[PDB]
Symmetry: C4
Amino acid sequence: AAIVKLGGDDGSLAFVPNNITVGAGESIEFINNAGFPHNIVFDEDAVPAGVDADAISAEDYLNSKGQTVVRKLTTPGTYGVYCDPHSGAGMKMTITVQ
Amino acid sequence: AAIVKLGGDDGSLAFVPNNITVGAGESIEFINNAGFPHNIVFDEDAVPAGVDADAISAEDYLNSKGQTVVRKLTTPGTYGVYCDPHSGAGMKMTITVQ
Amino acid sequence: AAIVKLGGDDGSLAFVPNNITVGAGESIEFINNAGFPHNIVFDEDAVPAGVDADAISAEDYLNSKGQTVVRKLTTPGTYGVYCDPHSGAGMKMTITVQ
Amino acid sequence: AAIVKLGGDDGSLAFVPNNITVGAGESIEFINNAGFPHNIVFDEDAVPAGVDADAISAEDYLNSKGQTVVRKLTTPGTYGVYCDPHSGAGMKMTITVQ
Ligand SMILES: [Cu+2]
Ligand SMILES: [Cu+2]
Ligand SMILES: [Cu+2]
Ligand SMILES: [Cu+2]
């Protein structure tokens, strides 16, 4: 089970960490930390063939500390993730599935 | 009128109870309890023929204790429900309509 | 300018009032009162020909007291409005435009 | 980096300022100020050819003071922006890109 914080303790508009490697079917926990609001959008152009980006995204805004979104990915490959609100700020990450 | 709590008192990411039987036209009350945020998504692949899953879902995030969503189902059958945010955590239920 | 409260002071899941008459171009103010969350959905099957129900709706959840949504309607006729979350509870209204 | 406040200090349902000029690729910061909730919708009929209004919008409601949405625009032209909730109130702005 991998943990990714949304917003840095210093208030940076980043995924912490912004690079992670998980096994297929391994739980990924996104925990709302700082710099609200955030969301988790899987990039339409940077997910494996056959994966439905819209289904794995979590678009509604996370506006409170400690809120969690849990996902499991099964198709191996790299996945580009970004936070819509803070896209302009470079708030994005890469998830590698094995 | 059936009551289903969103999140366990212990903070489990579950529908309590996760199995319920209601009559057609009987009110179903979903009450936000713990482990925010939650939502109520009727599974496209597990609802009766003719039911419009999108119309009975309530996709916007419930972020506060005591918030209520009220639904009435009229087509008899079983309905698979899940919480998008916590899908990865197994937060799902079954509603049987008579 | 017409005022419609979302939720009764007693906590009823109602539009107060649930019947109103406004002039074309007259401001309609929806004020979040009690029994959160609420939204304002214009019924696809009960709005005048040519009106785009999706454009006049305000679907994101209103979760705080005092929040306001302002609309102006120009096509004369009756408009059926409902609160998605509390549809099961009979939380609906009628707006007559002149 | 341009700053635009959502809601006036006096509680007016306005973008402050409601007219701004930025360079292509320059960061635009929308900061939630007063008169919640607000959102940022780029007008389908008033953005440059080729720009995807839906991608640059930020439709989920901003319900707290200090929340920030960051955008970067690269296609030169004028862009009409409005706040859905307060459209009826005249809460709109113009962004000129160079
Ligand atoms: Cu973010
Ligand atoms: Cu949940
Ligand atoms: Cu309501
Ligand atoms: Cu606004």
